[PDB]
Each structure stands twice: as structure tokens, then as C-alpha cells.
Amino acid sequence: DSSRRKWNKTGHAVRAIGRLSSLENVYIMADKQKNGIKANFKIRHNIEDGGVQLAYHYQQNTPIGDGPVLLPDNHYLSTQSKLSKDPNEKRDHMVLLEFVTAAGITLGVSKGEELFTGVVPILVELDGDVNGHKFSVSGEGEGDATYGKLTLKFICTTGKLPVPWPTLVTTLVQCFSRYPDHMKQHDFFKSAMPEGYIQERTIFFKDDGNYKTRAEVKFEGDTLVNRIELKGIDFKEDGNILGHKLEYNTRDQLTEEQIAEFKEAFSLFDKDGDGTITTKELGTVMRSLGQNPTEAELQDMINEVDADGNGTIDFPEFLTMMARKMKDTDSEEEIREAFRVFDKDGNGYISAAELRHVMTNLGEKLTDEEVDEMIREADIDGDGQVNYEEFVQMMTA
Ligand SMILES: [Ca+2]
Ligand SMILES: [Ca+2]
Ligand SMILES: [Ca+2]
Ligand SMILES: [Ca+2]
């Protein structure tokens, strides 16, 4: 099927631009008034059987001790988590593997960091109360900040956890993040150790309640300990949280067929075939789709996924951002936005002339018959056009 592969390539390009235009990282900034930092970010929780539950986080951290700390320039953390189960464990539990790296400062170490050069034991204790449903969680494992690596197992010590495990991941030690060499002066978290910091958040679950958390993170002997209280209010008993409607298992697939699909979209951008995407190349493709980014906007889009800070999107960086984009689910607003890239006139239907316009602009030399074949592959009800629902099915993996 040459039609379905043209949909895939084009769809992945639109999806790539979507990711580049989104803010998916953990954004950190100095909070001078508190001698610390604040942060904001959003988490996408896959809903079982379809859709996304958004969780908007606001965070602030303040040192526990009076020693000097590092106040960072603006930057972000980028995370990769894998949730699993221990087959021998009968209690309600979560096994967590996590890698976290700082970035967001283009190219061109505190005493506290010394405590993190090797493997450090971790303890986590959480008491929670969500809509009056109380619970406790205890966790243990270790952190290896050299690689930004955490391995932890958590148990609900009160029996059944009344909220989905994924909703507690962000609450359950950012001092283990890997900061690159050129960003070591921006690592507040380690700079506050061993005395530690207080971390507070409010977490807004869209169309549902919110969590309020306060935690003390500090060394107790040789162990890095995170002690947390969590209070949730305003939840719907039958919502995605209290109703346990969120996926547990990390959907970190990535067939080699999918990686190949990603590479095809990569090469639409990488038109000189040197294995990296520049602002110039990104701008070219966006304009072809009817957009008009400034140079500053293009730099910012690249910076959002530019792991090594060299100002371009390298092939491995592109694979990484696309993996994240496919792992997580897009919102209805985001999908409709992609739909509108094709549905130029906004009547709810992608016509042959509209599809032709897009493919032609992307430099895809396609005959009028080829376009027709594309429409047909997607045209479910047979009306000779592609409606939202049919577009969605073409875009879903
Ligand atoms: Ca290139
Ligand atoms: Ca790069
Ligand atoms: Ca239309
Ligand atoms: Ca149709």
C-alpha cells in the first residue's frame, strides 16, 4: 500500500511539527524571593481505551538550610519513565525505572554535587488523602545521577491505592537528574544538599480534581529521603482518577517499522541529507504547510528537543522526540489542529483538492490519480472526502 505510506510520512511530519510546537519538558526558573526555584510542566496520562488525561503541574522549591545554593538560568529537564510490575509481589505496587537529563541551554559544580558521584540509596514515604480516601506509600531503591538514573519500587502499605499509580510518579527526587557539563552551575537541587529542600506542588487534573503536595528531600545518613504529604480534593468518584481509568503500562513500543517511518519523516526535513535538521530546514517545511515562523520561533522549537545544545535537531534527537510523541496521546485540540493543516477551508472534510494542495506544497510529486488513491484509502463512508473521524483513523498507529 503506497497510499497508506504517503499518509504515514505526511502525518508524521505534521506530528513532528506538532511536537516541536509543544512544551513537554519540565521548565525550571530561578525564584530569588525564596532563594530557590519554581517550575511548571504538564503530564499526559493515557486513558484506557483511548484519549489523554492532562495533569498541569506548578512547583516551587526552597532550601532547608542557610548555606549558599545555585540559582539557575531558565532550562528544562527531560524524562523517560518505564513502569512495570514485580511478578512475585502480591501487594499493590509500582516498579519504576527513570532517566532524567537537563537541557535547554545552548552550547557556548557545587559541593552538594559531590554527594551524587556514585550510587545513592533512596527512601520515599508518602501519606495521601484524596477526597477523604487515605493511603500511604513507601518506596526504596537507588539513584545514579551520573546517568540521571533512578530505580525504585513502591508499595501501597495501606492496601489498595485509591488513585492510579501513574498519577503519583511526579510526586514520588530531582537531585538525581543528569546536568551536562555546560549546565552544572544551574543545578539547584544538588546544591541544596545534604541539608535539602522543601518541594511543593499543585497538580491540576483537567476536568477533574487537583493534588496539593509538600515534600522534604534531604539526606538522612547516607540515604536520600523524600517525605511527602499529599492532599487531593474536588475529584469525581467516577472520573479517570478515582475510577481507575488510566493505563498503567508504559506503551514504549517502537517497532523497527515505526523507526523506519520516523526516518522517512526526518528526511522530509533533512533535505540536504546531512543527518541533522537546521532552523532553515524546519522553516522551509513549515512554510510549505502554510505557516510562517520567525527565526526566534524556529530556534525555540529546536531548543525544546535539542539534547546536546548544538542548535540543530540531530537524527537521534528526532527519534527521541518522536518516540515521546507516539508514547503519549494528543488532546482533541491538538488532533483538530493537525486536521486543519489539511482541511484548509474548515468545513470538516478534506477534499481531493485540499490533499492535492498539501502534497504538492511538500514537493511530493503526485498524479491526480495518486491523490485520489490516498483519499480512497482513508475514505471510510465513501463520500469522496476525509472527515475528522476518518483522519483520526489514518493517523493512529
Ligand atoms: Ca540537514
Ligand atoms: Ca542537537
Ligand atoms: Ca475542507
Ligand atoms: Ca468520507
UniProtKB/Swiss-Prot annotation:
Question: Which Pfam family is one of this chain's hits?
Answer: GFP
**For this protein, what post-translational modification is recorded in UniProt?**
Contains a chromophore consisting of modified amino acid residues. Maturation of the chromophore requires nothing other than molecular oxygen.
Q: Consequence of mutating residue 173 to L?
A: In EYFP; leads to yellow fluorescence, folds faster and more efficiently at 37 degrees Celsius and has superior solubility and brightness
Q: Effect of altering residue 173 to N?
A: In R10-3; matures to the red-emitting state with excitation and emission maxima at 555 and 585 nm, respectively
Q: What is the effect of changing residue 79 to I?
A: Suppresses the 475 nm excitation peak, leaving only the shorter wavelength peak at 399 nm. In H9; increases fluorescence at 395 nm excitation
Record-annotated membrane-spanning stretches: none
Q: What happens upon changing residue 174 to L?
A: In RSGFP4; increases fluorescence and shifts the major exitation peak to 489-490 nm
Q: Where is it made, tissue-wise?
A: Photocytes.
Q: What is the effect of changing residue 43 to V?
A: In P9; increases fluorescence at 475 nm excitation. In R10-3; matures to the red-emitting state with excitation and emission maxima at 555 and 585 nm, respectively
Asked whether the keyword NADP is assigned, the reply is no
**Result of mutating residue 47 to V?**
In EBFP1.2; shifts the excitation and emission spectra to shorter wavelengths and increases quantum yields compared to BFP
Q: Kindly state a single biological-process term from the GO annotations of this entry.
A: generation of precursor metabolites and energy
Q: Which cysteines are joined by disulfide bonds?
A: none
Query: Which superkingdom?
Result: Eukaryota
Provide this UniProt record's keywords sorted from A to Z: Chromophore, Luminescence, Photoprotein
Outcome, altering residue 185 to R: In Azurite; shifts the excitation and emission spectra to shorter wavelengths and increases quantum yields compared to BFP
Known outcome of mutating residue 74 to I? In mut2.1; shifts fluorescence lifetime from 3.03 to 2.50 ns
Describe the task this protein carries out: Energy-transfer acceptor. Its role is to transduce the blue chemiluminescence of the protein aequorin into green fluorescent light by energy transfer. Fluoresces in vivo upon receiving energy from the Ca(2+)-activated photoprotein aequorin.
Q: How does it assemble?
A: Monomer.
**Membership in a protein family:** Belongs to the GFP family.
Protein name (Swiss-Prot/TrEMBL): Green fluorescent protein
Q: Which organism is it from?
A: Aequorea victoria
Its gene name is: GFP
